[PDB]
Amino acid sequence: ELPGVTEEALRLKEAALEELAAQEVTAPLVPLAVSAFLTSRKKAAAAELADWMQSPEGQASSLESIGRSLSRRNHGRSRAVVLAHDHDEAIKGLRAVAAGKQAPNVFSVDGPVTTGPVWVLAGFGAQHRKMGKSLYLRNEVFAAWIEKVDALVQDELGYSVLELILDDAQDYGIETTQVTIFAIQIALGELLRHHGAKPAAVIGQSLGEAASAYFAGGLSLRDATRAICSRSHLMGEGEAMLFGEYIRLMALVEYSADEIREVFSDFPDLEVCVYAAPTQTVIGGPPEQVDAILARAEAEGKFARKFATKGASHTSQMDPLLGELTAELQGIKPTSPTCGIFSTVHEGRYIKPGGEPIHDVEYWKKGLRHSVYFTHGIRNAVDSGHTTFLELAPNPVALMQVALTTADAGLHDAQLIPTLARKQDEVSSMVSTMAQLYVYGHDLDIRTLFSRASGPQDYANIPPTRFK
Ligand SMILES: [Cl-]
Ligand SMILES: [Cl-]
Ligand SMILES: [Cl-]
Ligand code: NA
Numbered sequence: 001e002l003p004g005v006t007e008e009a010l011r012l013k014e015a016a017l018e019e020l021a022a023q024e025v026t027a028p029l030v031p032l033a034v035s036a037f038l039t040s041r042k043k044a045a046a047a048e049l050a051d052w053m054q055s056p057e058g059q060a061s062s063l064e065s066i067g068r069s070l071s072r073r074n075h076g077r078s079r080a081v082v083l084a085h086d087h088d089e090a091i092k093g094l095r096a097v098a099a100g101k102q103a104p105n106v107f108s109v110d111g112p113v114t115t116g117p118v119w120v121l122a123g124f125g126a127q128h129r130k131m132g133k134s135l136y137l138r139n140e141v142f143a144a145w146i147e148k149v150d151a152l153v154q155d156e157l158g159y160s161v162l163e164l165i166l167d168d169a170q171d172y173g174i175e176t177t178q179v180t181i182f183a184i185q186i187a188l189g190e191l192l193r194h195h196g197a198k199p200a201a202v203i204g205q206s207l208g209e210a211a212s213a214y215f216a217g218g219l220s221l222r223d224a225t226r227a228i229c230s231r232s233h234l235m236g237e238g239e240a241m242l243f244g245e246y247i248r249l250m251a252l253v254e255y256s257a258d259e260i261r262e263v264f265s266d267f268p269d270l271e272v273c274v275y276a277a278p279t280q281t282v283i284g285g286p287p288e289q290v291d292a293i294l295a296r297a298e299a300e301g302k303f304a305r306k307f308a309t310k311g312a313s314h315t316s317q318m319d320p321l322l323g324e325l326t327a328e329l330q331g332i333k334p335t336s337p338t339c340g341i342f343s344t345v346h347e348g349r350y351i352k353p354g355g356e357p358i359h360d361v362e363y364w365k366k367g368l369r370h371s372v373y374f375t376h377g378i379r380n381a382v383d384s385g386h387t388t389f390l391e392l393a394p395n396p397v398a399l400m401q402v403a404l405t406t407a408d409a410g411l412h413d414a415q416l417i418p419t420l421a422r423k424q425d426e427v428s429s430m431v432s433t434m435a436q437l438y439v440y441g442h443d444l445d446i447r448t449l450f451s452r453a454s455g456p457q458d459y460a461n462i463p464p465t466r467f468k
Contacts, residue, residue, distance in 0.1 A: 002151040002152065002154075002155060003151050003154040003155060004151070005147060005150070005151075005160075005162065006154075006160045006162075006163060008160070008163050009150075009160050009162045009163045009166060012163060012166035012167050013137075013166055016133065016137055016166055017137060020137055020138075026085075026425070027085040027086060028064075028085070028427065028428070028431075029083050029084070029085060029425075029427075029428035029431045029432070030063040030064055030066075030067045030083070030084055030085070030090075030431075031067055031081050031082075031083055031431055031434075031435040031438075031446070031449055032049075032063070032066060032067050032070055032081065032082040032083075032084060032090055032093075032094070033067075033070050033071060033073075033075065033079065033080070033081050033435075033438060033439075033446055034046045034049060034070065034079075034080050034081075034082075034094070034097065035073065035074070035075045035076040035077075035078060035079040035080065036076045036077075036078055037076045037077050037078065038077075038078060039078040039110050041078075042076070042078045042079070042080055042097070042108075043097065043098045043099075043100065044098070046080060046082075046094045046095075046097035046098040047094070047095075047098035049066075049070075049094055049462070050090075050091045050094035050095055050098065052462060053066070053087055053090060053091050053094070054087075054091060057461060058087070058460075059087060061460040061461070063084060063085075063086065063087065063090060064450065064458075065457065065458050065459055065460045066090070066460040066462070067449070067450060068450040068453065068458060068459060068460075069459045069460045069462055069463075069464070069465045070462075071446045071447045071449060071450055072447060072464055072465060073463065073464055075438070075446065077110075077111050077112065077441075078109070078110050078111060079108070079109060079438065079439045079440075079441065080097045080106065080107065080108035080109075080439060081106070081107050081108075081435040081436075081438060081439050082094050082096075082097060082105060082106055083105040083106075083428075083431065083432060083435060084105065089105065093105050093106045107435065107436055107439040108439065109439055109440060109441075111441070112440065112441025112442075113387055113388055113415060113440040113441055113442065114385065114387075115200065115384075115385040115386050115387060115388070116198075116199070116200020116201070116386075116388070116442065117197075117199060117200055117201075117386075117388040117389070117390050117415075117417075117437070117442050118199070118200065118201045118202065118203055118342070118381050118386050118388065118389045118390070119189065119199035119201070119202045119203075119212075119215055119390050119391075119392060120202075120203055120205070120208075120389050120390065120391040120392070120393075120398055120399065120402060121185055121202060121203070121204045121205070121208035121209070121211040121212035121215065121392055122204070122205035122206060122207075122208040122374075122391065122393055122397065122398035123177075123178075123181040123182075123185065123205070123206065123207045123208045123211075123393055123394075123398075124205065124206040124207055124208070124274070124282075124307075124397075124398075125307060125397050126181065126393045126394050126395040126396075126397045126398075127172045127177045127180070127181060127394060127395075128394060128395060128422040129168065129170075129171050129172075130168060130422075131165070131180070131181075131184060131394035131395070131420065131422070132146065132165050132180070132183075132184040132187075132394060132420070132426070133165050133166060133168075134425070134426040134427070135420065135426035135427060135430065136162070136165060136166070138426075138427050139191065139427065139430070141190070141191050141194050142187045142188070142190075142191045143187075145186055145187035145190045145191065146161075146162060146165070146183055146184070146187045147162065148186075148221070149161065149182065149183035149186050149187065149221070149225060150162040150183065152221065152222060152225040153179050153183070153225060153229060156225060156226060156229040156230075157179070157229050157233055161176070161179055161180050161183050164176055164180055165180065165183075173236060174232070174235055174236040174239045174240075174309060174311070175232045175233050175235065175236025175237075176232075176236075177207070177232075178207040178228055178231070178232035178235075179228055179229060179232050181207060181208070181393070181394060182207070182208075182210055182211055182224075182225070182228040184392075184393075184394055184420070185208065185211035185392045185393070186211060186214060186221065186224075188392040188419050188420070188430075189211070189214075189215050189392050191430065192392075192433070192434070192437075194448070195434055195444055195445060195448045195449065196443050196444050196445035196448065197434070197437055197442065197443055197444050198339070198443055199215055199216070199339050199390075200339060200340060200386070201339055201340030201341065201342060201350075201381065201386065202215050202216045202339060202340070202341055202342070203341075203342040203344060203374070203377045203378065203381065204343070204344055204345075205274065205344055205372055205374045205398055206274060206313070206314070206372055207228065207231075207232070208393075208398075209227075209344070209345065209364075209367050210224045210225075210227040210228035210231075211224065211228075211392070212341070213227065213359045215339075216337040216338065216339055216340075216341045217335060217336070217337050217338030217339065218334060218335055218336075218337045218341070218357060218358060218359040219332065219333070219334065219335065219359050220333065220335070223332040223333055223359075226328070226329060226332055227329065227332070227359075227364050230325055230328040230329055230364075231321075231325060231364065231368055234321045234324055234325055234328075235311065235313065235318075235321065235368075238311060238320070238321055239309060239310050239311035240310075242310040242311055243310075245286075247286070247287055247310045247311075248284055248285055248286060248287075248310070248311055248312035248315065248317050249284065249285070249286075249287050249290040249306055249307075249309070249310070249312065250273055250282055250283070250284045250306070250307045250309055250311075250312050250313070251282070251283055251284075251290050251293075251294060251304060251305060251306045251307065252276065252280060252281070252282050252283075252303070252304065252305050252307070253280070253281060253282075253283055253293060253294065253297050253302065253303070253304045254279055254280055254297060254302035254303040254304065255279070255280075255281055255283075255297065255302065256278055256279045256281070257272075257275055257281065260272060260281055260283070263293065263296070266292075266293075266296075267285065267289040267292060267293055268289075269285045269286050269289055270283050270284070270285035270289055270290070270293065271283065271284050271285060271312070271314075271315040271316065271371075272284075272314075272371045273312060273313060273314040273315060273371060273372065274314065274371065274372040274374055275371060275372065275373050275374055275375045275376060276372075276374055276375060276401045277375050277401045277404035277405055277408075278375055278404060278405060278408040279404065280303075280401065280404065282307075282314075282372075284312025284313075284314070284315045284317070285312065285315070290306070294306070313368065314368070314369070314370060314371055314372055315369075316369075318368050318369045319369065321368065322365045322368070322369060325361075325364065325365055325368065326361055326365060329361045329364060330361065332359070332360075332361065334357035334358065334359040334360045334363075335357055335359075336354055336355060336356065336357055337351060337352075337353055337354070337355060337357070337358075338353060338354075339353050340352060340353055341355075341358065342377035342378070342380055342381050343358060343377070344372045344373045344374050344376075344377045345363060345366055345367040345370070345372070345373075346358070346373075347373045347376065348373040348374075348375075348376030348377035348378075348379070348380050349380070350380055350381075350384070374398070374401065375401070375404075375405045378401075378402050378405040378406070379405055379408075379409055382405065382406055382409040382411050382414075383409065387406075387411060387413070387414050387415055388414070388415040388417065388440060388442065389402050389406075389414065389415070389416050389417070390417040390418075390419070390433070390437070391416075391417070391418055391419060392419050393418075393419060393420065394420050394421075394422070395420065395421050395422050396418035396419070396421055399416050399417075399418055402414075402416060403416055415436070415440050417433055417436045417437065418433065419433050431449065434446075434449060435449075
């Protein structure tokens with residue numbers, strides 16, 4: 001059978017749980033949903049809830065019991081959610097809902113978003129030391145999926161990703177960044193499905209393509225894990241041996257594809273790694289030429305930033321890895337997708353649900369070797385009516401690129417929903433994520449955001465759980 005959690009992971013987990021229990025308890029973020037067929041009725045419901053919450057009876061009721069009772073109402077066309085830690089934040093946010101005013105912890109819209117969400121599976125440049133650790137310790141569904149991928153990666157590569165997540169002294173390299181972000185992406189998406197969410201379409205970027213294939217139903221979890229494991233360890237081993245004239249850097253520069261065609265005439269060995277946004281592109285090549293194009297960009301007032309790597313993925317430098325990558329992926333079973341795919345490997349084109357499989361061995365070779373057409377995939381999604389983009393990531397780096405494409409396409413009110421972020425509480429982040437899916441009308445059973453009631457004190461004395 002599959003390997004179990006290692007002894008060292010269990011040791012690290014015990015230590016982390018002791019440290020966690022020694023901290024001060026912070027008040028959880030509670031989602032308070034109010035809805036009605038008409039926005040005017042929703043605003044009135046918000047004002048009445050706020051009035052009652054200021055009464056002594058409302059003050060004596062926990063936010064969690066108020067939220068659990070609200071979660072059982074009929075969820076109408078016009079929706080709103082207040083995210084609060086205490087009664088004061090709740091009443092303040094509800095006043096904003098009632099008065100139609102905007103607030104950071106308030107989401108309120110007049111009706112549903114017409115098209116389903118695009119799940120964005122990226123990850124390049126998003127890793128950070130403690131990513132996923134807090135949610136692993138505090139959410140049992142997320143933890144179960146982390147442990148499933150951990151067991152598969154143990155089987156494929158012979159080490160435990162969970163050990164990396166739990167060990168604060170450990171940081172991530174070329175190889176371990178990929179398998180660990182993959183593990184976190186799988187577990188974040190399955191946590192969302194557990195609460196009723198589903199992608200209408202997926203779009204992958206760079207290392208995130210393996211997770212996109214799983215959530216699109218194009219590969220089983222085992223085969224998606226083979227894809228990320230085969231490429232990551234070949235890339236990590238190759239990058240570690242690069243010195244001198246063999247080094248190729250990667251850098252984000254504020255140049256469009258049109259500008260790069262002209263700019264590259266001075267730098268004969270530069271290649272495009274990722275078309276990230278309409279005016280931003282990840283490029284790769286020899287250090288002297290990468291240094292020169294960065295210096296040109298800064299002289300023109302344009303942004304430029306290097307990544308921490310001695311090798312350039314999505315360039316001709318990957319050629320020597322493709323033969324072994326072919327051999328390691330023999331036997332994977334591409335399947336017909338169960339949702340739409342905006343394939344950034346295949347230049348941003350759309351593959352319909354039920355379409356022919358795309359995730360064969362040649363797809364992973366092409367994805368590693370050639371450019372990532374990310375902005376074109378996003379633009380294809382915007383032009384087809386999609387407005388909600390949800391990024392599964394330890395840090396919402398790709399969502400900021402998506403915002404540049406959506407605004408460039410004329411969509412200035414897109415629903416850009418992050419998941420985890422460095423220096424933000426990972427439990428509260430997933431509450432905000434799921435509350436946002438709810439307010440926009442996407443599939444999400446808001447009842448599942450609250451544990452099952454054990455007694456009458458777990459409800460508040462308001463509709464629909466009034467105590468006769
Ligand atoms: Cl009911
Ligand atoms: Cl109701
Ligand atoms: Cl429960
Ligand atoms: Na461009």
